[PDB]
Each structure stands twice: as structure tokens, then as C-alpha cells.
Assembly symmetry: C3
Homo-oligomer: 130 residues x 3
């Protein structure tokens, strides 16, 4: 489905915070005893509405809520951390949970370079037939 | 292994309860503030002993207990939610954790339609050899 | 990267403890009510420095700490149990997260026995051409 922003307004810029994902700490700053307190672990960035991604994302978060709330209602876990890992598992099961029938629409196996390897081998025995 | 029910008795019908997995909520019922309390989130169904699945399942649950208890004894997690996700991961690793040697007994890759694609291409160069 | 032990010393033998992974319990010992208390669930073993694995492992644990501490700083989970399962997921995604182009360096599909199946089928139509 496409995402249709249907909110009263949209802030087209996203000034975000998160935790660092790349690069090493400086010196001993990685040691809990020496490093930042809880308030000082955040990085910041700014994203603009290229391709309408920001207004689309605001709408996406809004539309996700019902399914997410129903999921939380049905779980007995007090705090849920496993949603993305389960999505990754389901991604793999969708493609590799059954036998991969080559050339089928649900088998992500490309023998294109494998054809060029065998279609070039036709002249290996049919051309070399002295 | 096959499942041999060895219990004193078997209730051949399973009147079960669980949480809903399909279909949307009605109106605002998905909102925690408005929706059912803890006691009202359950659906019910009834299953009969077709193929002996119910008596088999009672025996299966009984026989699972030792391995499950030994697993719980060895974990330090207070509440364990990850068993099924780990089974899914192990399902994928069993089939895709190594190189898939096509035509081997442990490689779930079907080139049957791939043969028909190349065995039909024999007359592409051997029949068209004017 | 290779592992260079750069510690002041290395105990080349590893006298370890862990929990049992194989074989069934004896009699009723798997029942929590009857089985060992928390202190009695451990097995022990001894490993020597063949292939330098023990001194390498001491260095590996030391070198892992920075990345592990930075990971723990950034998580909101109070107790983290999911690291190995996430590694397994990432192992599968690295190999099977995209289309597998046969004969490419990132596609773990071996058609070697598949070649022998088709290269032996060359004389199925070219040799049998009466
Ligand atoms: C995802 O995005 C959508 C769209 O932005 C949000 O939709 C909102 O949904 C809520 C309901 O959950 C709406 O709130 C309701 O608005 C009704 C209409 O309000 C107007 O009514 C008067 C009289 O006509 C107008 O003059 C005036 O402009 C008001 O704005 C109210 O009548 C509702 O209040 C009544 O019902 C509630 C129960 O729902 C009672 O508790 C109240 O006491 C009262 O009796 C209610 O407030 C809201 O209007 C919707 N917004 C839009 C733009 O459509 C989603 O909420 C959002 N999802 C999430 C998870 O954020
Ligand atoms: C999976 O399914 C199987 C099969 O249904 C269950 O097997 C039961 O296992 C328990 C043991 O955990 C058995 O309980 C034991 O029964 C012994 C025999 O009881 C009979 O003995 C008298 C005298 O001969 C008979 O006349 C009478 O019919 C009794 O039924 C008892 O002797 C045992 O009690 C003694 O030992 C226990 C320690 O185990 C002490 O605590 C007691 O105080 C007492 O000294 C014990 O009660 C039970 O009989 C088995 N059932 C069957 C049908 O074989 C599994 O339990 C089940 N698994 C799970 C997880 O539920
Ligand atoms: C992985 O393995 C490596 C290598 O074994 C470990 O490296 C150690 O790192 C710590 C720092 O975290 C080092 O400790 C520091 O040592 C400094 C040097 O100590 C020497 O200084 C005097 C004067 O020259 C010498 O005569 C004497 O031999 C001392 O040994 C100290 O100066 C440091 O103390 C000062 O700084 C700290 C802040 O870091 C203050 O808190 C102190 O009060 C003081 O002002 C500090 O003690 C240690 O020397 C390193 N060892 C080696 C062998 O290099 C890693 O720690 C290890 N990783 C983990 C996670 O265990
Ligand atoms: N797997 C793991 O352990 C790690 C652990 C911690 N990581 C945290 C980093 O999460 C993000 C998420 C998003 C962005 C990000 N980039 N650009 C725009 C946005 C952005 C987009 C929408 C709304 C807000 C921000 C980012 O920079 C980092 C996540 C994964
Ligand atoms: N070479 C290709 O694949 C083509 C060419 C380049 N295309 C553009 C991809 O542009 C983005 C934009 C954003 C993020 C991104 N980072 N963090 C958070 C977000 C994010 C934020 C809001 C909404 C969605 C995502 C990103 O990762 C990539 C993709 C297709
Ligand atoms: N992945 C996820 O998030 C969801 C979250 C919540 N879901 C709960 C639904 O679980 C079941 C389990 C079983 C049946 C079920 N159907 N028929 C017979 C039986 C049945 C068989 C044996 C004993 C009792 C009942 C069912 O209807 C639903 C589980 C997965
Ligand atoms: N087309 C095929 O694959 C063939 C043809 C159809 N066969 C029959 C499958 O019948 C069932 C029965 C039950 C459930 C089921 N749902 N929920 C819980 C249970 C469940 C309950 C107790 C014990 C085991 C399972 C199910 O899902 C499917 C399968 C092979
Ligand atoms: N997946 C699961 O549920 C299970 C649950 C519990 N299991 C615990 C067993 O963990 C180990 C780890 C290591 C060894 C082990 N063998 N030889 C040498 C060493 C060893 C090497 C380095 C340092 C110490 C010891 C071992 O015997 C068992 C883990 C997995
Ligand atoms: N046939 C092949 O694959 C070849 C031939 C045989 N080679 C030797 C493998 O030797 C080991 C050594 C150790 C463990 C092991 N167990 N538990 C913990 C540890 C462990 C402890 C410290 C450091 C790393 C690991 C193991 O499992 C296997 C491997 C390649
Ligand atoms: C694939 O092509 C290479 C040449 O790039 C060739 O040497 C090789 O033999 C071909 N593959 C097989 C299985 O013959
Ligand atoms: C597979 O068969 C189709 C005809 O259905 C043919 O057009 C195609 O070329 C074949 N595949 C290859 C790689 O040639
Ligand atoms: C693979 O080789 C076997 C002989 O071991 C042969 O019977 C079979 O037909 C070959 N595969 C195909 C797809 O023809």
C-alpha cells in the first residue's frame, strides 16, 4: 500500500536524536565508570522531506499504532524488544522457509550468470567436434 | 519418532482459549483506554480428535516436559519467550547454514523447472544447426 | 583480524564450569522438586592451549569489552540475552538477505555436482545422435 498523509499538519523536517552506531570511543570514554551519564549518550541529526519521506513516516507511525497496540494487548511480555528480530526472521522464512524452485516467482536464486557459464559451454563440445 | 499416548485417559476434544490473530478491531476497540479488560481478550474454539491429533498432542505435551524443564533449569532468564524464535532460527540454519550443494540431500534447491528450461534449450542449438 | 595476546600473563589451561547440554537426567532428577539446587547444576571440564586457543580466547574476551560495553550503554534492556541469536540472524542475512547470484562470491550455492549432472548429460543427446 502507498502512504497517504492524512494529518492536520506535517512538520516536514525531522530533528532526531538516537545513540551512536559507528566509530570507536575516544580514549577511555567507553568505560562506564568514565563515560557519559544517561543524558549524554545521544547524537543528533536533521532530515528533510526529500521524496516526502518525513510526512510519509509521520503517517506510517500513525497507521502502525492499531496493529502495534493489538500486538501489545496480546503479549504477556512486560517490555517488548523482539519486534525487529522477528521481522528479520520472517523475512528469511518468506524466501527460504521452503524448497527454492529455481525460476519460480518466490525463489530468489539468480542463475543468469549460471546460464552464461553453460550457454558459453555449448561451444565447448558442439564447436569442438573435430 | 511417533507419538504413543500412554496416559490413563484422553479427553478427545480440545475446548481452547487464545488471543485473536486475524481481522481488525471494531471502531475504537483497539485503543487500550477503550478496549476489553484482561479477562475479555480471549477467543475460543473447539477441536476434535481427527487424525488422533488431540490425544497425540496431550502425549506430546507430557513428553516435552523433561527437556523443557532441563532447559529452564539451565537458563538464567526469569521468563522465557524466545523458544519458538530460536526454533525458527535453527530451522533456517539447518538448511542454509552452509553451502547448498545442488542435488544433495541437505540442499533444499529444486532445479526441476531449471532442467526443463535447459533440457528444452537443447533443441535451441542442436536442432537449429542448419 | 588475528588475535595477538598482549596481556601481562596467560594461564594456558582453562578449568571451566557450565551447564549440561547432552544426555538425559537420571530417573526423576529432571523434576525441579527433586533435582539439584542452584549450586549443583554445573559440569566441569579442562582445556589446554592446543593451537593457542586459550591464550587467544583470553585476548579475545579482553578485546571484545569495548564494543560490548558500548552496545550495553546503548540498549535499554536491563538484561541482554539476545546477542547470540542476533549473530545467527545476521549470519543468515549476510548470505541469504538478497538474491543469490550463482557463481558469485557472495552466493553460497555449489552447482559442482549440478555440473557433473549436466556435463554428464552432454552425451545423452550428442553421443546418442543416431
Ligand atoms: C492517526 O491520525 C488520525 C488523523 O489525524 C487521528 O484521528 C483522530 O482520532 C480521534 C479519535 O481517536 C479523533 O478525536 C475525536 O474527534 C471527534 C470530533 O471532534 C470534533 O467534533 C466537534 C463537533 O463536531 C468539532 O466541531 C471539532 O472540530 C472537533 O475536532 C470528537 O467528537 C471525539 O470526542 C468524543 O469522543 C471521544 C471518544 O473517542 C470522547 O472521549 C470525548 O469525550 C467526546 O465524547 C474525539 O475527540 C480526532 O478528531 C481524529 N483526528 C482527525 C484529524 O481526524 C488518530 O487519532 C491518529 N492515531 C493516533 C494513534 O494518534
Ligand atoms: C507424563 O505421563 C506419565 C504417564 O501418565 C506420568 O507418569 C506418572 O509419573 C509419576 C511420577 O512422577 C507417577 O507417580 C508415582 O506413582 C507411583 C505408583 O503409584 C501407585 O502405587 C501404588 C502401590 O503399588 C498403587 O497401588 C497405586 O495405583 C498408585 O497409583 C507412586 O509409588 C509414587 O509415589 C511415591 O514416590 C513419590 C516420588 O516420585 C513420593 O513423593 C511419594 O510420596 C511416594 O513415596 C508416585 O506418586 C505416576 O504414577 C505416573 N503415572 C502413570 C499413569 O504412570 C508423568 O508424570 C507425566 N509427566 C508430567 C510432567 O506430568
Ligand atoms: C585488556 O588488556 C589490557 C592489557 O592487559 C588492559 O590494559 C590496562 O588498561 C588500564 C587502563 O584502563 C591500565 O591501567 C592504567 O595504568 C597506568 C599505568 O600504570 C603504571 O604507571 C606507573 C607509573 O609509570 C608504573 O610505574 C606502574 O607499573 C603502573 O603499572 C596508570 O597510570 C593508570 O592509573 C591512572 O589513571 C587512572 C585512569 O585510567 C586513574 O583512575 C588512576 O587513579 C591513575 O591516575 C591506570 O591504572 C593498565 O595498566 C593496562 N594494562 C596493561 C598491561 O597495559 C585492559 O584494561 C584490558 N581491558 C579490560 C576490559 O580488562
Ligand atoms: N541494531 C542495533 O543494535 C542498533 C542499535 C541502536 N541503533 C540506533 C540507531 O537507530 C537509528 C534510527 C534511525 C536513524 C536515522 N538516520 N537518519 C534518519 C534517521 C531517523 C529516521 C526516522 C526517525 C528518526 C531518525 C539513525 O541514524 C539511527 C539502532 C540499531
Ligand atoms: N541505491 C538505492 O538503493 C536507491 C537509491 C537511493 N535511495 C534512496 C534511499 O534514501 C534513504 C533515505 C533515508 C534513509 C534513512 N536512513 N535512516 C532513516 C532513513 C529513513 C528516514 C525516513 C524514511 C525512510 C528512511 C536511508 O537509509 C536511505 C534508495 C534506493
Ligand atoms: N506469532 C504471534 O505473534 C501470535 C501471537 C498469539 N498467537 C496466539 C494464537 O495461538 C494459537 C495456538 C493454537 C491455535 C489453535 N488453532 N486451532 C487449534 C489450536 C490449538 C491447538 C492446540 C491447543 C490449543 C489450541 C490457535 O487458534 C491460536 C500465537 C502467535
Ligand atoms: N495440505 C497439507 O499440507 C496436508 C493436508 C492437510 N493436513 C492437515 C492439516 O490439518 C491441521 C490440523 C490442525 C491444525 C492446527 N491448527 N492449530 C493448531 C493445530 C493443531 C492442533 C493439534 C495438533 C496439531 C496441530 C492445522 O493447522 C492443520 C496437513 C497436510
Ligand atoms: N544453545 C543453548 O541453549 C545452550 C545452553 C547452555 N549451553 C551452555 C554450554 O556452553 C558451553 C560453552 C563452552 C563450552 C566449552 N566446551 N569446551 C570448552 C568450552 C569452553 C570454552 C571457553 C570457555 C569456557 C568453556 C561448553 O562445553 C559449553 C550453551 C548453549
Ligand atoms: N574438522 C574441522 O572443522 C577442522 C578440524 C578440527 N578443528 C579443530 C576444532 O577444534 C576445536 C577446539 C575447541 C572447540 C571448543 N569447544 N568448546 C569451546 C571451544 C573453544 C575453546 C576455545 C577457543 C575456541 C573454541 C571446538 O568446538 C573445536 C577445527 C577445523
Ligand atoms: C564458468 O566460466 C569460467 C570462465 O569464466 C570457466 O572457466 C568455468 O569452467 C565455468 N564453470 C564451469 C562449472 O565449468
Ligand atoms: C526459460 O524458458 C523460457 C520459456 O518459457 C525461455 O524464454 C527462457 O529463455 C528460458 N531461460 C533461459 C535462461 O534461457
Ligand atoms: C542426475 O544424475 C542422475 C544419475 O546419477 C540421473 O539419473 C539424473 O537424471 C540427473 N539429473 C537430471 C535432472 O537429469
Amino acid at each position: 500500500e502507498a502512504i497517504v498523509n492524512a494529518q492536520p499538519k506535517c512538520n516536514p523536517n525531522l530533528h532526531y536524536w538516537t545513540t551512536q552506531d559507528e566509530g570507536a570511543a575516544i580514549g577511555l570514554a567507553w568505560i562506564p565508570y568514565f563515560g557519559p551519564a544517561a543524558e549524554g549518550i545521544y547524537i543528533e541529526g536533521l532530515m528533510h522531506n526529500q521524496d516526502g519521506l518525513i510526512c510519509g513516516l509521520r503517517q506510517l507511525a500513525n497507521e502502525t499504532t492499531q496493529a502495534l497496540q493489538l500486538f501489545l494487548r496480546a503479549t504477556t511480555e512486560l517490555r517488548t524488544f523482539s519486534i525487529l528480530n522477528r521481522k528479520a526472521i520472517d523475512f528469511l522464512l518468506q524466501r527460504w522457509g521452503g524448497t527454492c524452485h529455481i525460476l519460480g516467482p518466490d525463489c530468489c536464486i539468480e542463475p543468469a550468470d549460471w546460464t552464461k557459464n553453460i550457454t558459453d559451454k555449448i561451444d565447448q563440445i558442439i564447436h569442438d567436434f573435430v
